[PDB]
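Record type: ASSEMBLY
Status: queued
Input:
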Amino acid sequence: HPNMDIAVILVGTTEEVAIKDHHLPVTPRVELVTMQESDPKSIITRICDLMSDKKVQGVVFGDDTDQEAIAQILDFISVQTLTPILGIHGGSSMIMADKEEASMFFQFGPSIEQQASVMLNIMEEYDWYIFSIVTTYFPGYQDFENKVRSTIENSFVGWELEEVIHLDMSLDDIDSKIQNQLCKLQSPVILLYCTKEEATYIFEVAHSVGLTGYGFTWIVPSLVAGDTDTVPDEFPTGLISVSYDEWDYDLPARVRDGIAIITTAASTMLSEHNSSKSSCNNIQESRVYEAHMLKRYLINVTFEGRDLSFSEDGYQMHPKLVIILLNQERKWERVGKYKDRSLK
Amino acid sequence: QDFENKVRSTIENSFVGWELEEVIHLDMSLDDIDSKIQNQLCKLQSPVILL
Amino acid sequence: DPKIVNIGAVLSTKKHEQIFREAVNQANFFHFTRKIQLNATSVTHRPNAIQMALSVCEDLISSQVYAILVSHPPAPTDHLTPTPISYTAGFYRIPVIGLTTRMSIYSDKSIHLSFLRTVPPYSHQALVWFEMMRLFNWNHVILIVSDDHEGRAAQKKLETLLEEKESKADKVLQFEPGTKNLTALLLEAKELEARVIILSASEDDATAVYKSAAMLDMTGAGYVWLVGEREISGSALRYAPDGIIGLQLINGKNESAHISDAVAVVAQAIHELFEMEQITDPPRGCVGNTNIWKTGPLFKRVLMSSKYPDGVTGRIEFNEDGDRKFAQYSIMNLQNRKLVQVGIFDGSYIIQNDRKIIWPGGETERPQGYQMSTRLKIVTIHQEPFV
Ligand SMILES: C[C@@H](CN1CCC(Cc2ccccc2)CC1)[C@@H](O)c1ccc(O)cc1
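Status: finished
Output:
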């Protein structure tokens, strides 16, 4: 008898996307949507147009794009309209610095902290004590740096960080201040924290200094790569990164997990609270106060013996991550598999 | 060459704790594009530089 | 030859819009119309954030805007108004210029990259506090702040200012906004030897803080109270103690003056930007465009290097964050339940006015601080030979 409306928006991808591609007591309604452009006005308008009278409470979003801006848009919309949003693939799943407590936006991507921790585990596994840090002013660099500095504090093991260099990408490069800052680099391992375009320009700059040459191995978060299919030509060979499982974890499976999260959260508050105005501008029904309990319940989700539970920062708690390495043929190969506790 | 070899000659027989870390020769015969001047000079450390 | 460049803006009313257009007319009037020509574009603030982002994507960005002005809208927006505009324009790295917005949350280059402002934030008041503590030589102060981004930014800035002298710190009191009973924190402050309290928080918080301090009789003689602009404004002004010291930034509620100043800086920036080559046009619409505007970081660079000494608010220079530097302030004293100007902050240090400085308790001249050195609680340890 009870039924809830959900909208699934997929953005045009190079890969074949078929709209035709355990239901819980609460009955989900799936609205299939295909979009051409990932731009903010397109996203906001289509989402607000898809709303209409359809009365969709849940929203599933994913993209093939490399744009980290999508997560900011989605978080802005979720924060503004007090509506659940789940980033699934690509740009929507990338990382931000700090989200408001009122924000219901959650991503399937790994937390920046856990990314840096995994990176440090890579450094430990290959036993690299000597390293360097290059970060941009993009959101989250403070978190990243602070995680490396956090780990180097309580370790009885030998650790040395030679440099932490923060590049400002807000200004155009003429004076080559980026070059001058990057040429000061020495250590064999350089931690680069930045977006994909930033990673491209910075890696392009590093070539003049020769930091992409042998003896230097770069260890990077999931924020830079984010797509194993599309590889920039400016990316140095031997680049180590962390990626969410693709072959192992399918894109339709992700959306499934999202609907599972939503439905399970709605069912959790069904047992607890025992009991949906849809539009952009405002809601006379209020209910914003009851939305918080729904969010809190949306945080903790147990499904199929696997926890999809999210984190307070907005990211996923313990997603499966695989360490990848860019080979001579310029394709991403998996050099590792990192679980909850053990490291492979 | 005379300058460098002179500095090294005088600094050779010095009982003092003299140390010169680097000697960098910039090529001005070609225009600076690759910024080899930049790359060579940024590697500099020592407080005093004889130019 | 007669080529036109479009400038977007968002202001309070059609009046301010007309002001802006007039400023653009004067701008093309004070520059060559032969080379390039200026075009004025502005829109009123939309009811909600989404509609405003849309208004940016159509009414502004689709018009190929080289900049976007932001001012406080009719009726209080709580200063959070320009955020979605800073986002949308910031997506394309189209520089956004603030006017009446004092919120320090915009001093982070991380959250808003393309966002500058023609007014200094609330965190920059630590400059005025610094000159005040400079000429009066007050070495002991308790820093009372609400727990938030704003208060923590002001705190960080003041600490950086305090980091100038070696090891300068007394006490750090952090409280959560909306707390009705500050008596614990105020008692922990009272246990501290410093009798001078500096409180930076929201008005509604300042009312409760002043209420609790008044309950603890911390507003009497021997104590000094130095606050900001938010603390003397609104619901807190009623409950403000006598002798309280405060600051008021010049042209703070003023849009038109800042509209003019921004127009001038933008004029300089635009006229300076066309001097280079390989200059690309801003996106002709939001729809279909993923990529950012490539000229944006350059234009931002030019904007932050802009120097405009003839500004209506005085000399205009931008700090690294994009906030205004060398802004003029007005020092305010509370005497006989009335606000009074004891001086002004211009450039370096501070110049004192002819008005007599008043302190809480009604003491004419009483620069008393650090108060009592008394019986000291001694924490000790157990060591067989020594103790
Ligand atoms: C945070 C980004 C801009 N950021 C905010 C706006 C967002 C697009 C958007 C528009 C309308 C509503 C929601 C979202 C796109 C991403 C920028 O500051 C930045 C980029 C790179 C960098 O190293 C430092 C700072």
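Annotation: DSSP finds eight helices and 14 strands in chain A.
Annotation: Chain A touches chain C at residues 36-42, 44-45, 48, 65, 67, 69, 72, 76-77, 80-81, 97, 137-139, 141-142, 168-172, 197, 280-282 (CB under 8 Å).
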